[PDB]
Each structure stands twice: as structure tokens, then as C-alpha cells.
Symmetry: C3
Subunit: 165 residues, 3 copies
């Protein structure tokens, strides 16, 4: 098709321009990064605790913190958080680790009009585990670089797709 | 951690205050209550019919009515309803009982601009089965008490979690 | 019940009125139609390509285009599209064919502020495969007729349900 091979030439140009524009920055705090396509996991084991921060660059942007007390590995404290605009906690609950789905029947603390004092203690709980406003600022730029890399990979996949046959 | 044990002391105070503030009221109509964490089920078997009202106190608040004609147990009439502000029916469809998921391919009657006459007959159909505005008012206070009990249980779980180690 | 048999008589009247008001139009372009209740699939195999347009009349209205290059059947280009108001592409990604779920970890091109030039090439890519504004206009009337047929079937199912016993 005329359109297809022109679309391929155009995608070639876009890939050059976006690579030229340019890598992944680091997170302070001894985190280890695990990439699964658009999903990133930052991991820290400290003092009988595993802390996992999970975000997906496809999506208001959010990240999920999972705190596992290694004494009792079946139930994790899960804190859904906003980042970018403001940091802030949106929801807290206990979940089974490694489930295919949030148990809808476990209680979820929505923070919408939450007592400022309980809210601040929750923020301090996160800060003590490394998830502070510095972490949230560093996450923005990691997320931003990761989105650009995956977008470039997508243009390549699209170019390869359209050029096949 | 300094913060952790202070967070525990604060949660201790909150648990006392919320229990002090204070149980589950009853539903008129011979309903039986089954609690699964934040999900409640109210059940009635009357005249060849099983009526199940399901709501989850995590979440505009809604409840689902499931009518099963005991002659043909495979397909249930499902009425998604709003409660609190106004009663009102939001959606009606037939679903297989005991499915893991709403069959997306079964027709769903959205009530958004629904003929008032069909709407009123649907309201009368529910009222005949006990789901009236009295039921919906009683549900608000049952839901409200159930949310408070589960929130108290959550503070205890949080306090226990943070205090461990 | 008094209400039930009156509801049955009323549903009888509604079914007559809606059938009286009146079938499924055709899609230009050699498409084959497969109905699964409220989900419709339009299918075309052309030049080493399978094109599938899927929409569900329950639901802003949208349809999904799936392009499979028969050389490599494991990954399909998926274009989520709006129809009715404007045509337009909302999201593009690669997905495994025949999955139970969108892989959340595959990159999704949201078109929200997308470069007009990449957007137009995507529109041309669809148009070359038959998904043009003519197709989208024809789809509106197919969807509209299909919703009416399924609604009539729903009134019959409701009438049959309420009349049983």
C-alpha cells in the first residue's frame, strides 16, 4: 500500500528524532529496579520488612506501596499514592500478597476527608520507609524517562508491524 | 522506630474513642444477614423466589438485588440500585447465578432516560419483594454501622501490624 | 401478585409497540457479522491480514479494531475508537490475540494530545483497511438496530421471567 510504506518512512523519522532527544535516573535509598514493560517495581528489604513501590507508566498518575512484615508474609499493608502534582495517600488496605486481585471485601481506608492526624501519621510511616517527597520527586523523572523509552520501543514495534509483508 | 511506636500509641487512642462512640440494626421483613468482611448479603426466600440484596461498605453507594425463580436457577434478574440520596434503579439485566463476572454480552437496561411507566413497574416489582423505600432507609443505617465496625477492625489490624517486631 | 400480572400485561403492550416500530443494515466492504448477544464482530480477511471490528451495544460508544498480520499471529495491533459523535482513535497498543485481558504492561498510545501527523497516519492506516468515516457512519445504524433488537429480546425475557409461576 502507498499509505503503509509512507507511514513506515514517517515512523523512521520519528524514531530518529526521539532517540536524538535522548537515560533512566536512579532512586536514592538503595532501591532495586525491576522493569516489566510499562510496569516498574522498586524494592527494598530493610529491617524485617520488604517495601515494594509499583507504578505503571501507561497511566492521574499513581503508585502503590506494599509493606510486608517478613514475620507474616500473607498480609501486606497497601498504600495507593498520587504523585506528580502532589504526593499524598489515596487509599490504604491490607491485601494478601501475590493475589491476582484486590480482595474487594477487605476494608479500604479512603483518605478523602481523613482526619489530618491519622493522615500525617500515615505520611510519616511512609517517610520512615524511604517513601518521602524526595522519593516522589525522583519517581516523576524515572517515570518520565521510562515512558519515553517505552514509547520509542512502541514506534519501533509499530514500524516493524506496518513494514512486515 | 520512634515514629512507629508513636503511631501505635495514637492508634490505641483512636480505637478507644471509636468504640466509646459505639450495634448493627435489624432489617424489617425477615431478612437474614451474611457478613463477608465489607460485603453484606441480605437473604429472603418467599414464594418460589430467592431474593438477595448485596452491598459493599467500601463504596455513590449502591446495592444489587438478585431475584432467582427457584424453577430455573441458572438465570437471575439483577437490579443495580442507588441508596442514601435517593433510592432508584440504575441498571437491570439477566445474569447467570454464581458467575465470577457479569456477562458483558447480556443486555443491560440502563435506566438513564427510561420511560417513567417501565421504571415505576420495576420499582413496584422490587417493592413487592420487600425492597421499598423503608428497606432502603433501613439499609443506610445498617451500612453505616457496618462501616464503623470494619473501620474499627482496620485500626486494630493497623495497630497490630505497626506494633509487630 | 397483583403487580406481577399487571407488569406482564404492560410488558406485552411494550413488546407489540416496539416490534411495530420495527432490520439490521449491512456494512459496505465485504464484512461478515458475528453476533454474541450484545457484542458484535465484523470480520475481513484481505491481504495477509485479518481485520476485526468489535463493539458492544450496552455502552461514550466505542469500537475496537484488531489487525492481525497472518505471518505472526501472536501480536495484534489494537485501536480503540470512538463513534457516533466523531470517529477518532482513543488508544493504540499491541496485544496478544485471544487473551482473557489487555496486558496492562504493554505500552498504550493514548491519543489525547497526540501529534496531528502521527494521528493522521493512524487514521489513514485504518482507512486503508476499510475503517473510514463511511464505515463509522454505517456502524452507528447497525449498532442502533442491534440495540433495539436486544432490548426487545430483553422485554420478552423479562415478561417470561415475571410470568413464570
Amino acid at each position: 500500500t502507498d499509505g503503509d510504506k509512507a507511514f513506515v518512512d514517517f515512523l523512521s523519522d520519528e524514531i530518529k528524532e526521539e532517540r536524538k532527544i535522548q537515560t533512566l535516573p536512579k532512586m536514592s535509598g538503595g532501591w532495586e529496579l525491576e522493569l516489566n514493560g510499562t510496569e516498574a517495581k522498586l524494592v527494598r528489604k530493610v529491617a524485617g520488612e520488604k517495601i515494594t513501590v509499583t507504578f505503571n507508566i501507561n497511566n492521574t498518575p499513581n503508585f502503590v506501596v506494599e509493606v510486608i512484615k517478613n514475620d507474616d508474609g500473607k498480609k501486606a499493608l497497601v498504600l495507593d499514592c498520587h504523585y506528580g502534582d502532589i504526593f499524598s495517600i489515596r487509599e490504604v488496605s491490607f491485601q494478601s500478597t501475590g493475589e491476582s486481585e484486590w480482595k474487594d471485601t477487605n476494608y479500604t481506608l479512603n483518605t478523602d476527608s481523613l482526619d489530618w492526624a491519622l493522615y500525617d501519621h500515615l505520611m510519616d510511616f511512609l517517610a520512615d520507609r524511604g517513601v518521602d517527597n524526595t522519593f516522589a520527586d525522583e519517581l516523576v523523572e524515572l517515570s518520565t524517562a521510562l515512558e519515553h523509552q517505552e514509547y520509542i520501543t512502541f514506534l519501533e514495534d509499530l514500524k516493524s508491524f506496518v513494514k512486515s509483508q
